[PDB]
Coordinates of N, CA and C (backbone and C1' of nucleotides) in Angstrom, one line a residue:
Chain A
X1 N 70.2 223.8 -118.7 CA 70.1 224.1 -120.1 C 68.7 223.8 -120.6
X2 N 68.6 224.5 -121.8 CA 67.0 224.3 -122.3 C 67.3 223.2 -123.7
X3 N 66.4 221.8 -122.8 CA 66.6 220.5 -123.6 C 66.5 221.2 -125.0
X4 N 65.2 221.7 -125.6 CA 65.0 221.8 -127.2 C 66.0 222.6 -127.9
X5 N 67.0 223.9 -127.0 CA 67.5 224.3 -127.3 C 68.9 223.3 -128.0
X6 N 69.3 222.8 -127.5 CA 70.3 221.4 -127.4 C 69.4 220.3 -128.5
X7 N 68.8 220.3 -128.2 CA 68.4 218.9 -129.4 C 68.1 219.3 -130.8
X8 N 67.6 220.8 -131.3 CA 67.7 221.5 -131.8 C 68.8 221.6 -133.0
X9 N 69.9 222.0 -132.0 CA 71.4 221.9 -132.8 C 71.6 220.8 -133.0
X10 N 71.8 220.1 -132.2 CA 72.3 218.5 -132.5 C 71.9 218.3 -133.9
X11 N 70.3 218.5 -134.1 CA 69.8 217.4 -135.3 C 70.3 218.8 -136.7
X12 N 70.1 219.9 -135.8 CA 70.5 220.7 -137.1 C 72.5 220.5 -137.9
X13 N 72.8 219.8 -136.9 CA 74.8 219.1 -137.0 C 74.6 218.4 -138.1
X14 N 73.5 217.5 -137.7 CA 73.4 216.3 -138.4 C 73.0 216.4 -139.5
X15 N 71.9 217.1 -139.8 CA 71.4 217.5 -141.1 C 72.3 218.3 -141.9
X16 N 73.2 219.3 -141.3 CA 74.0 220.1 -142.4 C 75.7 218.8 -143.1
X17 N 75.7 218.1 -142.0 CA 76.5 216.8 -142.2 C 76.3 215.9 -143.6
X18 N 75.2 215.7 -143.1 CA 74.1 215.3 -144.5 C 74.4 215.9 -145.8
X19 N 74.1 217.2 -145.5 CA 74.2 218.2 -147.0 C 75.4 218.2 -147.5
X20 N 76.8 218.4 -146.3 CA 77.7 218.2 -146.8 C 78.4 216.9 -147.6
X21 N 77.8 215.7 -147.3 CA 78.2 215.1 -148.2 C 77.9 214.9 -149.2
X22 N 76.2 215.7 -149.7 CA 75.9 215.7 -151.0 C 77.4 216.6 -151.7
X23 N 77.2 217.6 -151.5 CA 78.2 218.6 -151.5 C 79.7 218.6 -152.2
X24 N 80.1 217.3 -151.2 CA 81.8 216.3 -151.6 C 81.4 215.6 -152.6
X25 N 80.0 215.4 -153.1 CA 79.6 214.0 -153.8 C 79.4 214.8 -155.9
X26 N 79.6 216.2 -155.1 CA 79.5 217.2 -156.6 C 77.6 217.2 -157.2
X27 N 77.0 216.7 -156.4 CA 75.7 216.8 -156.0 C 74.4 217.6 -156.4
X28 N 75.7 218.7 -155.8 CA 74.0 219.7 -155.1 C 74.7 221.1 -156.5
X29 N 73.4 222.4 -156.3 CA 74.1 223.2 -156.8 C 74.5 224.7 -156.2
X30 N 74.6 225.7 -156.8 CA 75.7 226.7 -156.3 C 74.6 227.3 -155.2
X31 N 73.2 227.4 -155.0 CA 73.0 228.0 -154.0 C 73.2 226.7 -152.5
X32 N 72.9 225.8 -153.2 CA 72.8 224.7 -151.8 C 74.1 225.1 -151.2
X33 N 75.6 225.1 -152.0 CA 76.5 225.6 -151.1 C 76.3 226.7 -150.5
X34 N 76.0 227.5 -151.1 CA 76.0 229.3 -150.0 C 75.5 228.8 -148.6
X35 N 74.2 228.0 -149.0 CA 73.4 227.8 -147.9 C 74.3 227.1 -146.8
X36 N 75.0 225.8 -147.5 CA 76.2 225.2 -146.5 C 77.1 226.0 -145.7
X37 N 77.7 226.8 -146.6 CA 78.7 228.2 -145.9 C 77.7 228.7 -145.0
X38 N 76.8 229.3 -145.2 CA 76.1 229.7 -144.2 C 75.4 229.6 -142.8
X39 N 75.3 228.2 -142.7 CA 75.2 227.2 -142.0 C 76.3 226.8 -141.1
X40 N 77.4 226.8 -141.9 CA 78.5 226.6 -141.4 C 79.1 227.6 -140.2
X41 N 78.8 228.6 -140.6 CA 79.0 229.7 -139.5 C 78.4 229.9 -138.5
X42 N 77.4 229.6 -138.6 CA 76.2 229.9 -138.0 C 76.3 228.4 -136.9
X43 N 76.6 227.2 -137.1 CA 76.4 226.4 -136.1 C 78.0 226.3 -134.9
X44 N 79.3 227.2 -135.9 CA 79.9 227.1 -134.6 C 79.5 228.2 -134.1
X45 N 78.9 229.1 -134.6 CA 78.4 230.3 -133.2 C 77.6 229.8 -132.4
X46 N 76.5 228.5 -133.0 CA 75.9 228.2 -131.8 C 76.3 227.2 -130.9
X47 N 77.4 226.5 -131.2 CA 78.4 225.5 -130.8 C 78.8 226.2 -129.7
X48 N 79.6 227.4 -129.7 CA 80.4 228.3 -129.2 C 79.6 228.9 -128.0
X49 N 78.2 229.2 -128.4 CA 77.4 229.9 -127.0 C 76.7 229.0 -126.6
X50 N 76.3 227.4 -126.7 CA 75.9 226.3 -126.0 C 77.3 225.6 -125.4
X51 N 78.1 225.8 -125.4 CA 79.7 225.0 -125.4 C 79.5 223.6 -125.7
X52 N 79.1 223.2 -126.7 CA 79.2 222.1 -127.4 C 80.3 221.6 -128.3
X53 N 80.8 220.6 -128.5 CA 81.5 219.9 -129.1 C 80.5 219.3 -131.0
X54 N 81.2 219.9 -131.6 CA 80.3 219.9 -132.7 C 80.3 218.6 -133.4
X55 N 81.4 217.9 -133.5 CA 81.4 216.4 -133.5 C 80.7 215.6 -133.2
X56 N 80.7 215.8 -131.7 CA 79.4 215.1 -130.8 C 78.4 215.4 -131.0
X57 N 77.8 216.8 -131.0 CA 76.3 217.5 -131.3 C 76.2 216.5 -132.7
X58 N 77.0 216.3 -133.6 CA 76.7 215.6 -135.0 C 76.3 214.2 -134.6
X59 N 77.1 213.5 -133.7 CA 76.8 212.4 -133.4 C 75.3 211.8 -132.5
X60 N 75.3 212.5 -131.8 CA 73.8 213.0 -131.0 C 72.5 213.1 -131.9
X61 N 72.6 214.3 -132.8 CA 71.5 213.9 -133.9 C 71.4 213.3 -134.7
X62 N 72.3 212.7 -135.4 CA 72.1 211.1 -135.6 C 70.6 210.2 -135.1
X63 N 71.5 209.8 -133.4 CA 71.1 209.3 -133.0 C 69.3 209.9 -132.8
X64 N 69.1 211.0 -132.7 CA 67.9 211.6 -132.8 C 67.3 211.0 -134.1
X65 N 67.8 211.9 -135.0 CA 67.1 211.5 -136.6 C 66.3 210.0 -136.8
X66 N 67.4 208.8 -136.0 CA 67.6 207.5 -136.3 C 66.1 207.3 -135.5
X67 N 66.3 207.8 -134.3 CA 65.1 207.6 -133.5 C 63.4 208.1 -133.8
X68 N 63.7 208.8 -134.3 CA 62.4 209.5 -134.8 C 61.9 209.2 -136.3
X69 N 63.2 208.9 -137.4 CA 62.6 208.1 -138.5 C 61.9 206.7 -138.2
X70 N 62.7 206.3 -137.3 CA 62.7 204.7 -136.8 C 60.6 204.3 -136.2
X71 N 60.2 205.3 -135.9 CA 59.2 205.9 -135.3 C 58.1 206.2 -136.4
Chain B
X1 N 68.6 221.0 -165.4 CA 70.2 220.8 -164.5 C 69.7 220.0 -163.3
X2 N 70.5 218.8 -163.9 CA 70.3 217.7 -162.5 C 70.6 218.0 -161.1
X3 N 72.2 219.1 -161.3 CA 72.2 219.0 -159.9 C 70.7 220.2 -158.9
X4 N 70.2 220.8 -159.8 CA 69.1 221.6 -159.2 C 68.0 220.9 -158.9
X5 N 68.0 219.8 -159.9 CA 66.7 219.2 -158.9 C 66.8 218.3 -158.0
X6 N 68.1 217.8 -157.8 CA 69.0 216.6 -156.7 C 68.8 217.7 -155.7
X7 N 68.8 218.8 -155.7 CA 68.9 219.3 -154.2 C 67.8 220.3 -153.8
X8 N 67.0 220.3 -154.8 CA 65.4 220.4 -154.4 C 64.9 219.2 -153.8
X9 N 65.1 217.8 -154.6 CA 64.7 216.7 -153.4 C 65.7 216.7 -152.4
X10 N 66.8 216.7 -151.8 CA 66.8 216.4 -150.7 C 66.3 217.5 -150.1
X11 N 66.8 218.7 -150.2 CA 66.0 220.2 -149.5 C 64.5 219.5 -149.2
X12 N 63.8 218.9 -149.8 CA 62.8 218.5 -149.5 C 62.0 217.5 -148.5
X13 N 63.4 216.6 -148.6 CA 62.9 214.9 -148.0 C 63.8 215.9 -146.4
X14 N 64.6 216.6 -146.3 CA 65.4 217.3 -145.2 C 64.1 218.1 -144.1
X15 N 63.5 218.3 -145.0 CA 62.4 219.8 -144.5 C 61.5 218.8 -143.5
X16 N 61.0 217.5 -144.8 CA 60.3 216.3 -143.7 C 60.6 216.1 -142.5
X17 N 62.2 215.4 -142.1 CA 63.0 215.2 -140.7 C 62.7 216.3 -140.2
X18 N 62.7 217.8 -140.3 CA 63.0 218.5 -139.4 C 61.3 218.3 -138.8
X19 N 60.2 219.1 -140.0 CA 59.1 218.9 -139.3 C 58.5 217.9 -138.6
X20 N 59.3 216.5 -138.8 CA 58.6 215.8 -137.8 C 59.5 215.6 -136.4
X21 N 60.5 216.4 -136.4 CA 61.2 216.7 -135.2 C 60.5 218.0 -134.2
X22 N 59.2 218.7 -134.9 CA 58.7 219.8 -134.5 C 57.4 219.1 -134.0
X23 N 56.7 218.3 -134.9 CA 55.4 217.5 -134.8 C 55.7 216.6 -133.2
X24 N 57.1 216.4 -132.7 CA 57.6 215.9 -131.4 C 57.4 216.8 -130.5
X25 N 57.3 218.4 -130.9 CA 57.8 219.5 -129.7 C 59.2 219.0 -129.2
X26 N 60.0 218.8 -130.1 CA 61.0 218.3 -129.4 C 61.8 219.6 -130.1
X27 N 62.1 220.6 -130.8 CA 62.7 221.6 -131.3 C 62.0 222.9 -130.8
X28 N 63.0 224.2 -130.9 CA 62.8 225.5 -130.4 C 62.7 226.6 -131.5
X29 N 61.9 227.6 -130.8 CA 61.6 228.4 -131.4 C 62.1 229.1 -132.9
X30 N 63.3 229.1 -133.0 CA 63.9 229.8 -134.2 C 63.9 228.7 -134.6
X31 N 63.8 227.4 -134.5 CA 63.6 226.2 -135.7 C 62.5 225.4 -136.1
X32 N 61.9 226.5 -135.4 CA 60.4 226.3 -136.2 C 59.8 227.5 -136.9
X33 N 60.8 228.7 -136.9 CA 60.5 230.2 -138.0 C 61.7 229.7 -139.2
X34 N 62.6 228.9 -138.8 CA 63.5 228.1 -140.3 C 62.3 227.4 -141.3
X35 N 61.5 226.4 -140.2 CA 60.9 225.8 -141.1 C 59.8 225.9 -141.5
X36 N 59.1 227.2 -141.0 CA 57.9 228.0 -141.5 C 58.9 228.7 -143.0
X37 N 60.1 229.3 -142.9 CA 60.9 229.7 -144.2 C 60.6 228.9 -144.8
X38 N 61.3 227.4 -144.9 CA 61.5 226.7 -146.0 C 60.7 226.4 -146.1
X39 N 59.5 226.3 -145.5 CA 58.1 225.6 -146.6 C 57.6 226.4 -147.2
X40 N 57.6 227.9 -147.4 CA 57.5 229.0 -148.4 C 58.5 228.7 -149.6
X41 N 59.8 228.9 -149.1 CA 60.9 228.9 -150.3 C 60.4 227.4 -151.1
X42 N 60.4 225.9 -150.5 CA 60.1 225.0 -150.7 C 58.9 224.9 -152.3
X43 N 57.7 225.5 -151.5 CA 56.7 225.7 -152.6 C 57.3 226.4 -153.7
X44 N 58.0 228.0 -153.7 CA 58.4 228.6 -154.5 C 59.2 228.2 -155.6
X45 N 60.3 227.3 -154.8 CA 61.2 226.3 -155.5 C 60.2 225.2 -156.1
X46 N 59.6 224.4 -156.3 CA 58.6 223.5 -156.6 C 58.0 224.0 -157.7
X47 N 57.2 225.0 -157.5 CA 56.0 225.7 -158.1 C 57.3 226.4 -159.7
X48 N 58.5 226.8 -159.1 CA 59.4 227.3 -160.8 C 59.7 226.4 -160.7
X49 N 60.3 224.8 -161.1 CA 60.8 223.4 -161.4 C 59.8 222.8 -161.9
X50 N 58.5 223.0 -161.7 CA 57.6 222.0 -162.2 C 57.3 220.9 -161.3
X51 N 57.8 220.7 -159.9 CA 57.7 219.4 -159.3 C 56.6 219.2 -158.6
X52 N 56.4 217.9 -158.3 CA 55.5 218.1 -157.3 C 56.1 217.7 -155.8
X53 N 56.3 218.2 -155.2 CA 56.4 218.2 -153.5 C 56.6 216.5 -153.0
X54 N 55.0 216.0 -152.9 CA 55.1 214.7 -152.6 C 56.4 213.9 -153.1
X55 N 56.2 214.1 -154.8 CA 57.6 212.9 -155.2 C 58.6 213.4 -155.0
X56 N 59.2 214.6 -155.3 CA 60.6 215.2 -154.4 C 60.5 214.5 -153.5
X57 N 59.6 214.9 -152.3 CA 60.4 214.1 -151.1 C 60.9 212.9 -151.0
X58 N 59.8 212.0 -151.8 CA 60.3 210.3 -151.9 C 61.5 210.4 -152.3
X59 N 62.0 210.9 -153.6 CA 63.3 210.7 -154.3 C 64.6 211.1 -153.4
X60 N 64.1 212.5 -152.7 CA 65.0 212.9 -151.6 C 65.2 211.8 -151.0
X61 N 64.4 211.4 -150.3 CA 64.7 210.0 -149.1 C 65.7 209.2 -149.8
X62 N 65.6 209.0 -151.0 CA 66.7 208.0 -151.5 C 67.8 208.6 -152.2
X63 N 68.3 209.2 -152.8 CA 69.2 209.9 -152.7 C 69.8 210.1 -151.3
X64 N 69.0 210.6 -150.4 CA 70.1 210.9 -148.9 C 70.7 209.3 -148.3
X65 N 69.6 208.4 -148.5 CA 69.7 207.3 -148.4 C 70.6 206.4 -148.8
X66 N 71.5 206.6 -150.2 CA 72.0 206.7 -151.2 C 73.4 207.2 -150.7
X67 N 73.0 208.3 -150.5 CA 74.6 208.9 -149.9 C 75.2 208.2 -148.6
X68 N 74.5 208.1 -147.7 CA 74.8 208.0 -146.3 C 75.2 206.3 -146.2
X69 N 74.7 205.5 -147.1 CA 75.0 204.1 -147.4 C 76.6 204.5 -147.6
X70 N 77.2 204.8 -148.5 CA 78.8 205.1 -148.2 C 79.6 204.9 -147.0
Chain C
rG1 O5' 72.9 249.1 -129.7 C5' 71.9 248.3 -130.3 C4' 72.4 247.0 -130.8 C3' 73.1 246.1 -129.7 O3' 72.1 245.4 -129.0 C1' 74.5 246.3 -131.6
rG2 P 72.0 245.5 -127.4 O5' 73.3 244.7 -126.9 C5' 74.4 245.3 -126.2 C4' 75.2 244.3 -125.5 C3' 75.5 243.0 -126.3 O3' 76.7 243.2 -127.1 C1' 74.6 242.5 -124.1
rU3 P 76.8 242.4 -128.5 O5' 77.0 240.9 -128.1 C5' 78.2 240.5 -127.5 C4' 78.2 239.0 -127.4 C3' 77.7 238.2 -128.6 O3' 78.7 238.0 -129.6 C1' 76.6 237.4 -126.7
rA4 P 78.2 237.9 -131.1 O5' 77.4 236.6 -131.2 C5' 78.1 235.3 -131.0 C4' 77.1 234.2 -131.0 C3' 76.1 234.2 -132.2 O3' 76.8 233.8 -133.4 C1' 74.9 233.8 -130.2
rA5 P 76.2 234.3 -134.8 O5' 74.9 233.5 -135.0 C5' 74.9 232.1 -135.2 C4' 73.5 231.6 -135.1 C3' 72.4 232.2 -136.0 O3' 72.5 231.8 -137.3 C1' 71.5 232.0 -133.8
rC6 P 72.1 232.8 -138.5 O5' 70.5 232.8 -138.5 C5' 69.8 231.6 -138.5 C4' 68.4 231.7 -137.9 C3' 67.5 232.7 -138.7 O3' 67.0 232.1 -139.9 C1' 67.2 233.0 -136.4
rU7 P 66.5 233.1 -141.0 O5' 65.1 233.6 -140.5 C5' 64.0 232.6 -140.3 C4' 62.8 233.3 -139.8 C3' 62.3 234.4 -140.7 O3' 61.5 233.9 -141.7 C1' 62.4 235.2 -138.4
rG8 P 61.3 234.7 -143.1 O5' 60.4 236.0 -142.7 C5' 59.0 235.8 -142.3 C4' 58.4 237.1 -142.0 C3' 58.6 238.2 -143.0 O3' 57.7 238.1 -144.1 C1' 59.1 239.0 -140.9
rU9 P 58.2 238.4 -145.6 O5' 58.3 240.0 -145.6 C5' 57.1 240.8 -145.4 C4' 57.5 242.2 -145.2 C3' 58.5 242.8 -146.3 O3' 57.8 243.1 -147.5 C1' 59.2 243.4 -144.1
rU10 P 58.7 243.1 -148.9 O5' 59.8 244.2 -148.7 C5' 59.4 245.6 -148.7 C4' 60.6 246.5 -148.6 C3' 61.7 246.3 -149.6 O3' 61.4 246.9 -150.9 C1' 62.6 246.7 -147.4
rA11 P 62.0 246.2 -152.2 O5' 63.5 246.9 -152.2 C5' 63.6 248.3 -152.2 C4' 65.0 248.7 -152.0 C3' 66.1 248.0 -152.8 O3' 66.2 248.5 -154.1 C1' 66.8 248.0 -150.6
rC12 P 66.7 247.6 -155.3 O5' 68.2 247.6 -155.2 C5' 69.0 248.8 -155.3 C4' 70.4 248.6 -154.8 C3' 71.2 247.5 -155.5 O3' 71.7 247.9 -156.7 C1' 71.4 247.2 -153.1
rA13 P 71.9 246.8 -157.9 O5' 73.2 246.0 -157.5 C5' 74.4 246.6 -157.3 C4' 75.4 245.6 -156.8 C3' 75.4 244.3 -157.4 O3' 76.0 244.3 -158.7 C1' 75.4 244.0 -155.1
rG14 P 75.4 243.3 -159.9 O5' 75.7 241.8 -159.3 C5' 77.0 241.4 -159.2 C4' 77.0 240.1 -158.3 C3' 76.5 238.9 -158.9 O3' 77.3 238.3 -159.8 C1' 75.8 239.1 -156.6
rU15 P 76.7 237.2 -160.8 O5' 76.5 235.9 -160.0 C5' 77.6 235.2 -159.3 C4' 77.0 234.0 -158.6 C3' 76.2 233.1 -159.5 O3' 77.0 232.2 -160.3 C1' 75.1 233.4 -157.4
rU16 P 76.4 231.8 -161.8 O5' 75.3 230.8 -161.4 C5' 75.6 229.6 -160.7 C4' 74.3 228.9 -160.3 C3' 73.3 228.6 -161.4 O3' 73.6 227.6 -162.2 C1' 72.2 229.4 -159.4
rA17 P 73.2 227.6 -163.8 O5' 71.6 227.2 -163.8 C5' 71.2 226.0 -163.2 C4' 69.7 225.9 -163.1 C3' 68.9 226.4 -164.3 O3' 68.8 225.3 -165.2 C1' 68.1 227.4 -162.4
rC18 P 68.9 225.7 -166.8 O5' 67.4 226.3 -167.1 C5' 66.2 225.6 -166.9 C4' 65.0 226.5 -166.8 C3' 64.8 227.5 -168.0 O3' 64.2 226.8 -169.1 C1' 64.6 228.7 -166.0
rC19 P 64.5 227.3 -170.6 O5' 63.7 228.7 -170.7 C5' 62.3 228.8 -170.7 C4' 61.9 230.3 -170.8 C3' 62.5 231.0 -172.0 O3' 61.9 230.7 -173.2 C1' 62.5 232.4 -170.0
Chain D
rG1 O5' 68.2 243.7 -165.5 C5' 67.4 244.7 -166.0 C4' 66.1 244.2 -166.6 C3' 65.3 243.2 -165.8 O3' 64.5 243.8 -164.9 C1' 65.6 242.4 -168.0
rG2 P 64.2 243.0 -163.5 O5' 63.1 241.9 -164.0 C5' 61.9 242.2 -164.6 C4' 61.2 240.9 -165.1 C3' 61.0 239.9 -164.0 O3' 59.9 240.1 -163.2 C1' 62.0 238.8 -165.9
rU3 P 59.9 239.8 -161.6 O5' 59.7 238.2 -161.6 C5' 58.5 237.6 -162.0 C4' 58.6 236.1 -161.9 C3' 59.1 235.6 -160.6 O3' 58.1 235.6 -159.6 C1' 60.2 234.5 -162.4
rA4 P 58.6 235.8 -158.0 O5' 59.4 234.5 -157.7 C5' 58.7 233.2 -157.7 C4' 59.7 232.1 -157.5 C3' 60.6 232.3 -156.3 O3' 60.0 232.0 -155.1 C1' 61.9 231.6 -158.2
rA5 P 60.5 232.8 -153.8 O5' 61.9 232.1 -153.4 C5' 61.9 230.7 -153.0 C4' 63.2 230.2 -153.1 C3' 64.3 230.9 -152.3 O3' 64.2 230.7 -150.9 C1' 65.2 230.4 -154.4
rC6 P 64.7 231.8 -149.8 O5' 66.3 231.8 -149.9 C5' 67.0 230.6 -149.6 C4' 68.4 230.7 -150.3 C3' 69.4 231.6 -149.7 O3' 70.0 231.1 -148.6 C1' 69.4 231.8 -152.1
rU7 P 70.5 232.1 -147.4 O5' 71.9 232.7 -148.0 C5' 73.0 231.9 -148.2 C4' 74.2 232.7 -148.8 C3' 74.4 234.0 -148.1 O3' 75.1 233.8 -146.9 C1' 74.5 234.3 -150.4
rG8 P 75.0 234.9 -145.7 O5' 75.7 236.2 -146.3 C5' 77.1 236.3 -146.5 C4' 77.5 237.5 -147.2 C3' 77.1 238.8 -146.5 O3' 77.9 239.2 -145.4 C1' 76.6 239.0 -148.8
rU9 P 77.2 239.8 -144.1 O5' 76.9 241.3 -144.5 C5' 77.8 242.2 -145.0 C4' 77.2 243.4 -145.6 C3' 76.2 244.2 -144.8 O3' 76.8 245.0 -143.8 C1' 75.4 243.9 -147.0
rU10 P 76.0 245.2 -142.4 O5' 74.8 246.1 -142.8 C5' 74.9 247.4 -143.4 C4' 73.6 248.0 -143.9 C3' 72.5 248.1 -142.9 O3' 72.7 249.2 -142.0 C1' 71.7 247.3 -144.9
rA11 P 71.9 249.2 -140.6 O5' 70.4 249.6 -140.9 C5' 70.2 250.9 -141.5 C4' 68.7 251.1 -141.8 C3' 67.7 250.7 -140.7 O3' 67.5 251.7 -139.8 C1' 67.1 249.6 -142.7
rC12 P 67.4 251.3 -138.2 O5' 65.9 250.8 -138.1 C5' 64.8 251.6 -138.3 C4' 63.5 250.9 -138.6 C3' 63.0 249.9 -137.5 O3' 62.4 250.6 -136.4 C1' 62.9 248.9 -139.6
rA13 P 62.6 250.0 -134.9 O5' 61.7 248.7 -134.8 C5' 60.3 248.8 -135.2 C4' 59.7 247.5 -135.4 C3' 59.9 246.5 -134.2 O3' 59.0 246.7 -133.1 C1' 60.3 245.4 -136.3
rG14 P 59.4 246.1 -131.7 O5' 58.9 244.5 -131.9 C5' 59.7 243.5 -131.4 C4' 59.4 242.2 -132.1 C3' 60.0 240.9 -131.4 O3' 59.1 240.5 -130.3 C1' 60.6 240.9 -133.6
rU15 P 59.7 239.8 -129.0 O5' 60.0 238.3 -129.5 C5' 59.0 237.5 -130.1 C4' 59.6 236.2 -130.5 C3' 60.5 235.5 -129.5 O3' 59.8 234.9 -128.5 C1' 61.5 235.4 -131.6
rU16 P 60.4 234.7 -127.0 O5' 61.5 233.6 -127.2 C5' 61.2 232.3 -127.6 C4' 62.4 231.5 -127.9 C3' 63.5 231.4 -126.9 O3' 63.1 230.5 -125.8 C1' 64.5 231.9 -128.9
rA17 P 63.6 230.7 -124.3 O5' 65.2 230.3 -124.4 C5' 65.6 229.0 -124.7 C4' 67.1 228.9 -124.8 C3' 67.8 229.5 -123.6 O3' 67.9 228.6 -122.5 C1' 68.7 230.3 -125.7
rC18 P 67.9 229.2 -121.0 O5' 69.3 229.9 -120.9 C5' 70.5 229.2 -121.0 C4' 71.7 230.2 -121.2 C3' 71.8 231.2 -120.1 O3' 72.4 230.7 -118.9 C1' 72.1 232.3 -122.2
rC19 P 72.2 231.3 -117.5 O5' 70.6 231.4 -117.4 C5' 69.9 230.5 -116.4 C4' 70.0 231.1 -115.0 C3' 69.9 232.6 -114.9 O3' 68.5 233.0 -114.9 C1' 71.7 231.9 -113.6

RNA sequence: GGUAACUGUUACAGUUACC
RNA sequence: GGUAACUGUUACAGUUACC
């Protein structure tokens, strides 16, 4: 597999994760959701054609983000 | 409207993580034509709000910072 | 339209903020 | 109606991953 391709999603899991809690939090406003719906679709299709587990890809970039802020 | 500018900073302090996930070469091609987008839309958004860039992002950082403490 | 995601340019319908 | 950003749809041209 192509690492960037993979690390790519992961941190993009992470980041829409993120948004979504602004989201639950009553937060953000009506385009930032479109953009979440949009997003949303868009990462199990690429879930679906990397066979990733999107949980984990969430948990993964995390650990990315963590590592590269940390930095 | 608060919530429009709460999500111009994080959209903002967000755009940061990714670019310095690019500044790594550690990301691929279509996510670095995402974040050639949003630094267009970015300015556009900024430039109608009145903001400036720099402090969005700081504020973003804390707000996300903010949330994720939960 | 190979599958999936995306970008640039264009149009329409719409959403949000502001006037 | 306008400015900006976006969502859906569309036209043209492309990028990446997939032995």
């Amino acid at each position: 597999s192509d690492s960037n391709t993979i690390t790519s999603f992961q941190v993009d899991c992470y980041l829409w994760h993120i948004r979504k809690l602004l989201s639950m939090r009553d937060m953000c406003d009506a385009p930032f959701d479109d953009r979440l719906r949009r997003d949303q679709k868009a990462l199990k299709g690429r879930g679906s054609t990397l066979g990733l587990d999107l949980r984990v890809a969430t948990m993964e970039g995390k650990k990315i983000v963590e590592d590269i802020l940390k930095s």
